[PDB]
């Protein structure tokens, strides 16, 4: 079978950055500080 191509793998990786953004590390971790950060101190 024509295994995939080097062209269908573009479309899989294209959906990775239009679902979740590029600034993930700041935004996602800070979101947990508002929910579960303040109550534990």
UniProtKB/TrEMBL annotation:
UniProt-annotated location(s): Cytoplasm
Domain of life, source organism: Archaea
Protein family according to the UniProt entry: Belongs to the RNA polymerase beta chain family.
Assembly and oligomerization: Part of the RNA polymerase complex.
Function: DNA-dependent RNA polymerase catalyzes the transcription of DNA into RNA using the four ribonucleoside triphosphates as substrates.
Annotated protein name in UniProt: DNA-directed RNA polymerase subunit beta
Native source organism of the sequence: Thermococcus kodakarensis (strain ATCC BAA-918 / JCM 12380 / KOD1) (Pyrococcus kodakaraensis (strain KOD1))
Origin organism lineage: Archaea, Methanobacteriati, Methanobacteriota, Thermococci, Thermococcales
Boundaries of the shown chain within the full protein: 9 to 49 of 1123
